[PDB]
Design a protein around this ligand. Sequence first.
Ligand SMILES: Nc1ncnc2c1ncn2[C@@H]1O[C@H](COP(=O)(O)OP(=O)(O)OP(O)(O)=S)[C@@H](O)[C@H]1O
Ligand SMILES: Nc1ncnc2c1ncn2[C@@H]1O[C@H](COP(=O)(O)OP(=O)(O)OP(O)(O)=S)[C@@H](O)[C@H]1O
Ligand SMILES: Nc1ncnc2c1ncn2[C@@H]1O[C@H](COP(=O)(O)OP(=O)(O)OP(O)(O)=S)[C@@H](O)[C@H]1O
Ligand SMILES: Nc1ncnc2c1ncn2[C@@H]1O[C@H](COP(=O)(O)OP(=O)(O)OP(O)(O)=S)[C@@H](O)[C@H]1O
Ligand SMILES: [Mg+2]
Ligand SMILES: [Mg+2]
Ligand SMILES: [Mg+2]
Ligand SMILES: [Mg+2]
Lengths: 48, 422, 429, 135, 32, 412, 435
Amino acid sequence: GSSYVAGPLEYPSASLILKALERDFWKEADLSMFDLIGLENKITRHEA
Amino acid sequence: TQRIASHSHVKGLGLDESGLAKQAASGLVGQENAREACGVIVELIKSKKMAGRAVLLAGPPGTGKTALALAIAQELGSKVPFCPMVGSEVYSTEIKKTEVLMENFRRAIGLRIKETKEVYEGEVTELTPHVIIGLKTAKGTKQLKLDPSIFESLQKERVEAGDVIYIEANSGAVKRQGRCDTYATEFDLEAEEYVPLPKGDVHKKKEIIQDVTLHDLDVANARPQGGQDILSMMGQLMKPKKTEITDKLRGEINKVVNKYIDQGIAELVPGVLFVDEVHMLDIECFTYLHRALESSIAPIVIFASNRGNCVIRGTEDITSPHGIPLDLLDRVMIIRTMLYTPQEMKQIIKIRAQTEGINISEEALNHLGEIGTKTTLRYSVQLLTPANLLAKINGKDSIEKEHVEEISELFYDAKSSAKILA
Amino acid sequence: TQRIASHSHVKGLGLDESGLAKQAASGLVGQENAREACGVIVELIKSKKMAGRAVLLAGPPGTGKTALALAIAQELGSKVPFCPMVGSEVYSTEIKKTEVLMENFRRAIGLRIKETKEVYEGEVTELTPCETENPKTISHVIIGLKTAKGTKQLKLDPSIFESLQKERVEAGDVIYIEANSGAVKRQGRCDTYATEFDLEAEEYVPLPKGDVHKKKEIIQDVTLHDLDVANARPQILSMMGQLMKPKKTEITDKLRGEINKVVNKYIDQGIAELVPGVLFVDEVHMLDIECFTYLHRALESSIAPIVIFASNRGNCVIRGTEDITSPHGIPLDLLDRVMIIRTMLYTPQEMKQIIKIRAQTEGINISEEALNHLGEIGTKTTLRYSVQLLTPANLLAKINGKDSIEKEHVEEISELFYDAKSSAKILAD
Amino acid sequence: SLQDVIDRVAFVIPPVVAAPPSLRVPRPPPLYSHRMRILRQGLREHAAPYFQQLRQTTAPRLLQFPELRLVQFDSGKLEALAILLQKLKSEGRRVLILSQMILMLDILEMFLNFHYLTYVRIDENASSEQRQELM
Amino acid sequence: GPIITYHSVTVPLVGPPARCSRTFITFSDDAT
Amino acid sequence: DVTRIERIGAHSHIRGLGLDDALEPRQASQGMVGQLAARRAAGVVLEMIREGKIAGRAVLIAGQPGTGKTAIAMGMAQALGPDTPFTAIAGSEIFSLEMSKTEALTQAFRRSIGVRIKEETEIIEGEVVEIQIGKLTLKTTEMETIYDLGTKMIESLTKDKVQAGDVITIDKATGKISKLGRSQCPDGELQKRKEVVHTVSLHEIDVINSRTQGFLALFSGDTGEIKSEVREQINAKVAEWREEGKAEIIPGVLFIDEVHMLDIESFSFLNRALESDMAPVLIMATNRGITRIRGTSYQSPHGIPIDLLDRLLIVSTTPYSEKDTKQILRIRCEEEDVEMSEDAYTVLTRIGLETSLRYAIQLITAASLVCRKRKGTEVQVDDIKRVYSLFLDESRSTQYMKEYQDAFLFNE
Amino acid sequence: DVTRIERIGAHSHIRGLGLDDALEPRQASQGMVGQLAARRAAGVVLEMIREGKIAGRAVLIAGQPGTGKTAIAMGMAQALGPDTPFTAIAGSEIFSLEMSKTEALTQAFRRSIGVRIKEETEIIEGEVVEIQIDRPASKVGKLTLKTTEMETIYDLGTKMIESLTKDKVQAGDVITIDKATGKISKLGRSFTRARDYDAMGSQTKFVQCPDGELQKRKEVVHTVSLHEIDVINSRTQGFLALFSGDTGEIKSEVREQINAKVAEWREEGKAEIIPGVLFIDEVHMLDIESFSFLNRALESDMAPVLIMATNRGITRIRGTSYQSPHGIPIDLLDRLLIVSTTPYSEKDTKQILRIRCEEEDVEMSEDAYTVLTRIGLETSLRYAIQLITAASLVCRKRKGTEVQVDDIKRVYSLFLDESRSTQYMKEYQDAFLFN
Ligand SMILES: Nc1ncnc2c1ncn2[C@@H]1O[C@H](COP(=O)(O)OP(=O)(O)OP(O)(O)=S)[C@@H](O)[C@H]1O
Ligand SMILES: Nc1ncnc2c1ncn2[C@@H]1O[C@H](COP(=O)(O)OP(=O)(O)OP(O)(O)=S)[C@@H](O)[C@H]1O
Ligand SMILES: Nc1ncnc2c1ncn2[C@@H]1O[C@H](COP(=O)(O)OP(=O)(O)OP(O)(O)=S)[C@@H](O)[C@H]1O
Ligand SMILES: Nc1ncnc2c1ncn2[C@@H]1O[C@H](COP(=O)(O)OP(=O)(O)OP(O)(O)=S)[C@@H](O)[C@H]1O
Ligand SMILES: [Mg+2]
Ligand SMILES: [Mg+2]
Ligand SMILES: [Mg+2]
Ligand SMILES: [Mg+2]
């Protein structure tokens, strides 16, 4: 006894759907200055 | 022998060729009008033309509603899907009520898909890293090039040269099942198990017929287990849980199944959804059932209810003739089950005794029927096996009147207990 | 310890050898009959014979029911597991209420594990194999171990040669070898070879003190709930489990039975000794009908701990019922399973004694007339209220440069702070 | 500790299996493709030290063969032959099994493996010299 | 090539019969 | 091709609204019978939808049970082009255990607005002649060409084994090679430029951009409460596509059948949701008269609060007459391939007027089966009376429940 | 002596139903006192369970509080033994945050059906007398086993060599090798290691030498519930959820597959169904949805014998506004037999107190027995039972040997029953909250 195996449900869409939320780098600032949690794996209060 | 349940004696509806109900046939006794209506319902299900037609078996407790539903299931056969469910099963903690109803609706549509299964089997000779592996069988030896996924599966099975392996190329699944019986004598003692070499060709194609519901396809495509790739594998680590399958997925599955039917590689078998106690649904469920039953994909749905004019669940003070809102009673055909005469009760008790392997004398049977004219039919039936046990303990191979009387003195019915409490 | 809580003065039931209650001892005043019944409960706990016995502390607010339960806890010592709960804790969002109840039941059963290990530890001084003719073949591997006490040579089985090279033991390494398994474990270079110029941390250890061969006894205290949690979810599946939130789970009875079997095997083997203890459920009237009914079955278990309930609700409707009033908020069926200890209101003298003992524990100097005034305040208002006035009046006195509370300080603090009844009066007006 | 009892009970196969749906686009974005590529590269790099564990702890149970114990069970002749061969093996005797046709020899030697009684087969498929060589 | 022989046999105890087990690791060549 | 998944449902016979270009409703057209005013109003709403200029227009269809409101909605769905979205949900479906009511309502709204994006791609389809690793030679029945291969294309052709004689298609911009067999060889040009047009709903864009491989949530559900920032940024990007001309917006219809199952919170949410420029046309149906709004004690003219009732236009559906009932029975009989005698039609019309229309429609199939059992060809009055005896309507079943009230449980 | 996990609980004195061969109850046997009709009915139900031929038989034990309903249930369980599954739950246990009530009842029903698998295994059993392993620095080895009757020298494959090395097999070990899978288990040693080896700090007892043939055909019996089969088959790591209870709602398709295959395994010789008992104490905590589920669940062939208990009279069914006997809908009451328990008399109460004194090991005088029986009749049976224990502790405090009347009066004064505590609460009601 064996399972049926179906082919995958292919899901067509336009390329633009994936390009959404992509902003030009001339409108993205270095927001990393506000990144807090990223410093826990990097530095220490005494090291700071 | 298989264990005996409450409805084991029911083998069908007991209709003649013209569809009139015989008085006592196939387990059922009496209830001719309801049996003939269930006959028409069986023909409706067999016709496979109508979608979403609903029928309600409504009648007092003990009047055979569930027996009639199971008799319909028997008359249909095992080929036709039959999904028994209870309205109280809709209160999932995982998915919404409407999703549970929809999943039961999709369970009741069956699909026989003919699928060509191709298998590579043999004893491995070479495992050169894409991989050019070799397989040898009772006929001969072939060299094959396979996807690296199959090689990773072989490594998962830890296949070494000289082992007998089974490769289903359709699903990318490899089963290493033993080392070849040729090696079974080389060492006086080893931890492995030996199996003979395969007798057929290395690459074999076999055509099989698979029985699945539409619900199986829906859940398989919603939670894929066949990706065999890094992301799908990482997803498979997650705890399983029912999910609210979308209408887009079900539409895609409908299109795929229509393509299968058009190609001739599949046949669709509309079956039955049976909701045994529908009054435990709430007003949200009934409102959803309006839209669901109007669907063109829906199965034939059977309802049973024993409530009088009672309050609809999920409402405050709305009463309806069976606990089902008037809007849903308009969409169903109603079959009424009537109370039994003493003679019909005695016939049912005799059938139950013969199904339970119990011998009972005429005087004991008459006393049991008299007890069943009081109390209920089910109470009187349930006294058969205690009384036969006490007969066996007293060294008798048949229930006598004294054994029935003593069991009725040991075990009380609902009415007697209520009288004692009151 | 150091901070002072509402019960920090309760040091135990002030009972004599005869079981009678002293009028005022061990921080408790009055409640003599209740304290004597609590002492009988303590004897019940220490007998370890019985399971699931229930006792209800019942009486007006501020009659010392919680003080009496914590006094039982003091009498039983730190060896007996005493699990405090309040009835509000059953309403968890991760698990069902009856699972919370069963988990707290198993927290009150203690188990004490005794492990006796034999170890040969020292700095390695030689690793010479002993060659032989087989009846190169070796019949022994000689290891010399040095400690501060002395040196010993061991005649180990030759098979230990695999573990020595696996651990990469060399001369100058501190190692230990367990008698049972015979596997060696390496724990670093001896610090006598460390210089201040080389940089390593984990690879150095001080030369062991004591004899080379040691017999170690390890005693660990656990609860059955600890074993339940350990066997329910052992610590790539671990990566996903530690990334995801580890919620409480509804541990099955199968696991509890398996752990009962394992603990009975340990108790038979002599490795472990059971210490069954006490579950204390304060504000038990916050339990609902489903919890009380479950407790019917829970207290009838032969494995259950001794449970102490406390309630003050009087004739009150049971939560999760409608209009079912009960003598304590506790259904009569559960009340038939508990022994009830009544607690009674205090006299003015008993209240003055409690106030004085509180002032002593808080480190407060109180004058005689101030004590009388605060006692009479406590005969009005409540005892709790009058006790709460002690430290703010002490602070007011410290501001005015007085080392002891004077009556004027009590009066001023009373004028600043009001009780529940006076506030109800203000609200009514 | 149940591993032995677990493998005896693991038998449910799913009725349907399907690969995950694939989102199809013309002209896939370079940024989206690059991000997916680096995601896959990182996941596979981290999986490599633990890959066999991931593979075994994720691969689904798709196939279900009938247990070799049924090859005995299906026929009473093979049951009595099992009794006789076990008894004769306890007496140090060797056995020649004669049967009419090739397929019966196939299922016989499968049964003989299930009894752990190692065998050698000669039948019409052998050349003239190999029949005597195996004898 | 080089071989390491792990050998464990019954040997009779000295001051069924009184017996004990003893192990005789053996090495093929002086280099290993 | 036997017994397809689509079978005969309750509204299968409805193929449209049956209106002229003047929206004058024909008495019997496209399966619709009667309801002339309500069908005219549905057609006006349909023209509103087709124009798609105005956003947030809501219409309520109100009437007695069985008066063809869901049938009107189904006809509007059928008449409306399949390109334009038409989301149809019951009011009880928004009570999800995986998302809030407002979140489910938002998803339903966003499913009902489609974004149509057109893009061109270049497709190569031919038969392989020679492959050298690189050079590739492809031929059709009309032309042959040799290509100079790049490193990535060489890798793609190496991963997917391509040899001489294979028929393959290649996406020029991506190198996606799929083999469709071995050699009929394609006839025309080897390299073709194709426009392809996808309609993607706002919900799909939301869910795809919600997380890595978020499109799996479009099928299984598993979509939590989508973040508001994602939706706002996707609205901004869609507006930018509309301004630049790379997309067109296709407003659709959200139909909430039996909307009285919604609660006061859902209605209040709808009050503001219909005021956005991306709101679709909402259509609702309810048979309730003056009755309590769920979640409140207040009775309201449809179970709908007067706040929402002021944002919508109401279409009323009348009872049917004898002629319309007979015509509906005729159309249902034709839909189910059931032949009935004229006397049977009259009797079934009388039964339908007396008891219910749905009951008569069900009796159609029951009588057809009973006729087939007796080896009949046309349903007669005797068959109608047979199935009328076998199957009860609600009134008669209620009367028998009153007759044996002592046997039923919790009867009141 | 030693404090076991199991201590003296409320029903530790129950050893069975105390019936004869004819199921006629004895007055005082196996810890049961009185309840003759109820015990006879429980005996008939226990025979019905042991025959196992009838599925979905429900019995409700109804009676006044403290009349022995849980006692009769525990007697049935004790007389059933461990072979037949007996799942006892409180009715409030089904209300879960992990699963629906119907799933909880499904799992409860399927915990109460055993599947007893049988398999034959090839087992090697003997004492190792010599082992040689040679490895490059493939592995070649030689192993000799003895078993009194024979001594066979085996040439070892690579995998068996790895297994023997992992087990660290030494000469003088009595081992077991599973020829089907190569699993090696050590039963014990037959003689010491060489006295000349340091460390080795053990003097373990040496088991007797194996006998008979080295290789035997061994049949092993494994019993699992249906719920275990369900959980193990539900997911890749399902077995971990059998202990943790982290089981979501198992798919109904999986359970249908398990039912089908188990039915085949019982048409074959591979497995045997052992149908057991589900005991739902205080069943009135179930709501209408649970009762409705119980209606259909009892009609399956895989349903066990359902035993229920409740002391409620005509009361309101949970989740509804209707009043029905026992708090159970009449349609489920139609599906069951009711067994009634009777209040005890002076003699029965005294015998119960005697049995409880015996199990608690309390010596008590005959006057103490009379006064305690009077107290138990006046107040309750459980209160007098708990006074046994307290009066024992009070007597031991005074260094007495036998609990006398004074100790019972003293513990009566210290610990109150419901009635006197209620009277004192009413006498001081203004001090208690909300009147
Ligand atoms: N006509 C009949 N002939 C033979 N056995 C019957 C007949 N009607 C009922 N029974 C049996 O008698 C019992 C009655 O149970 P059901 O048929 O389920 O009644 P019911 O209509 O389902 O009542 P409720 O609403 O579920 S309480 C079952 O054991 C049936 O198998
Ligand atoms: N007899 C006593 N001797 C000494 N301190 C006492 C005594 N009784 C009460 N106290 C203390 O006075 C306070 C009141 O006693 P509690 O144990 O809090 O009363 P209670 O019975 O728990 O009230 P409820 O029911 O929880 S509101 C606590 O700080 C106790 O430590
Ligand atoms: N004008 C019509 N023309 C053709 N068929 C119709 C017409 N009106 C109703 N029907 C059909 O009659 C049946 C009942 O009509 P429905 O549309 O379900 O009534 P309804 O207005 O939706 O009542 P509710 O509110 O849902 S209970 C369905 O099969 C419809 O397709
Ligand atoms: N017939 C009996 N023989 C011996 N001990 C009994 C008997 N009946 C009850 N007991 C004991 O009396 C105590 C009361 O338990 P039970 O009477 O079984 O509980 P119950 O009768 O179901 O009362 P409820 O309804 O749960 S409050 C327990 O310690 C029982 O072991
Ligand atoms: Mg039923
Ligand atoms: Mg307190
Ligand atoms: Mg409608
Ligand atoms: Mg009880």
